[PDB]
Amino acid sequence: GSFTMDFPYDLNALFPERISVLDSNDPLPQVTTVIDELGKAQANRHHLYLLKDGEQNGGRGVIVGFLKVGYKKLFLLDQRGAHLETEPLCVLAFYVTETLQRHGYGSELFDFMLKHKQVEPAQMAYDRPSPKFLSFLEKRYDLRNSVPQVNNFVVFAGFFQ
Amino acid sequence: SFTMDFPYDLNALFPERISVLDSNLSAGRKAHGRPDPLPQVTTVIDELGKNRHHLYLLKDGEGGRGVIVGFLKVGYKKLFLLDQRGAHLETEPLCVLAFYVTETLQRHGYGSELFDFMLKHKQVEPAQMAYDRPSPKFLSFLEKRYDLRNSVPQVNNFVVFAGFF
Ligand SMILES: CC(=O)SCCNC(=O)CCNC(=O)[C@H](O)C(C)(C)COP(=O)(O)OP(=O)(O)OC[C@H]1O[C@@H](n2cnc3c(N)ncnc32)[C@H](O)[C@@H]1OP(=O)(O)O
Ligand SMILES: CC(=O)SCCNC(=O)CCNC(=O)[C@H](O)C(C)(C)COP(=O)(O)OP(=O)(O)OC[C@H]1O[C@@H](n2cnc3c(N)ncnc32)[C@H](O)[C@@H]1OP(=O)(O)O
Ligand SMILES: [K+]
């Protein structure tokens, strides 16, 4: 249980963000309890996935990572450098808490999104991805061959077709 | 209300800022024996919806589970705007991106309570922000409650008023 709210049906359907918390199958970092604040110190909605793992505090546990995807209208270059407008699903944010990286949490988060969006990794665009995320994509999803862009998004060979 | 523990680095990098605040006029009304009627609701457990943007949720409170009666989402956006004489102008104001109060409770002052809370806490006036594709009811809201009447025509789907400049 991650939320304690009741939503009217209309508000829920028009809710500007889609959010999912899933449980996971180690050094615990320091945490803060969030109560009423997160992040503090015909519409195509982005989908935020959060991963929980642990039984701290009678099962409450800890959110160890998040993944945000979404549709974005992108003007891309193709294989022959021709221009092409398109609206793929994009990874917009991807993070696992530092001390728990390289423990498989990211893979779990990413896999859940694929299964449920029924998209493959080569069919998405990646917004300004970090070195670690590139490595992750190259090593765990065999995404090796990129088609050069000038708009800060990365897309791989399979995307075209 | 949330029941999660966030690591500090994850919290600081969290891609969205979200705030839930309790309603005063909802509390006052219930307290004086004339609470507003709640529609049928769904209990959320692990699913919602089935420069960071800031999402505000207004809770009608119980002391059990309250009810979210409205939401307001703002965020900074880089915009290429036209001014009053049509000169081009790039600027990055706070924008309203989404604004909704559940249907049966519209026109009870709830939208005003959310909008006022955002203005105080973001410390902006309504004329200094831009409005992304606002619905007719929201325009009405702006015109009637905040005296935002004079629009400066744009071609990019955002609405801004004279005071903005
Ligand atoms: C487009 C944007 O959203 S950019 C994403 C934001 N990320 C950052 O700023 C820094 C790193 N942050 C992270 O959250 C993670 O490292 C992620 C999200 C990229 C991957 O999630 P993890 O839980 O770490 O991935 P998981 O453990 O499932 O798989 C591990 C693989 O990811 C990569 N990886 C994870 N940590 C590192 C690291 N420190 N250096 C290099 N590669 C790394 C490697 O491919 C690794 O495989 P290896 O152990 O065989 O070298
Ligand atoms: C940028 C984007 O997000 S566009 C906004 C999305 N809106 C919609 O899809 C439809 C309407 N949805 C709503 O959620 C609301 O009516 C809001 C958010 C626009 C205003 O919230 P409320 O809680 O209803 O506002 P509040 O009760 O404080 O003030 C009422 C004023 O809003 C306006 N308003 C509210 N409902 C209506 C309506 N059916 N018709 C016309 N104006 C309305 C009027 O100006 C009204 O003043 P009046 O009663 O003197 O005419
Ligand atoms: K509360």
Looking at all shown ligands, the one closest to residue A100's CA atom is 1
Burial class (CB in 10 A: 0-12, 13-18, 19+), A8: buried
What resolution in angstroms, rounded to 1 decimal?
A: 2.4
B129 Cα distance to chain centroid: 12
Enclosing domain of residue A58: 1-161
Ligand 1 centre distance from Cα of residue A4 (Å): 32
Q: Out of A91, A101, A109, give the residue to mutate to test ligand 1, the one with the largest number of ligand atoms within 8 Å of its CB.
A: A101
Handedness of CA B44, B50, B56, B62 (dihedral sign): negative
Q: Residue B91 sits in a domain of what CATH number?
A: 3.40.630.30
Q: How far apart are CA B156 and CA B152, in angstroms?
A: 12
Q: Do B70 and A11 touch (CB under 8 A)?
A: yes
Residues 6+ apart with CB under 8 A from A101: A132
Quick check: CB of B107 below 6 Å from ligand 2?
A: yes
- Phi first, then psi: give them for residue B67, nearest 5 degrees: -135, 130
Q: Closest approach of chain B CAs to the CA of A69, in angstroms?
A: 11
Instruction: Report which ligand 1 atom has the smallest distance to the Cα of A129.
Output: 1
Please check whether residue B58 is in contact with residue B114, taking contact to mean a CB–CB distance below 8 angstroms.
Answer: yes
| Number of domains observed in the structure of chain B | 1
Between CA B95 and CA B105, with CA B99 as vertex, the angle to 5 degrees is 155
Burial class (CB in 10 A: 0-12, 13-18, 19+), B105: buried
Q: How many CB atoms lie within 10 A of CB A36?
A: 14
Q: How far apart are CA B66 and CA B63, in angstroms?
A: 8
| Contact A7/B at CB under 8 A | yes
The coordinates were experimentally obtained by X-ray
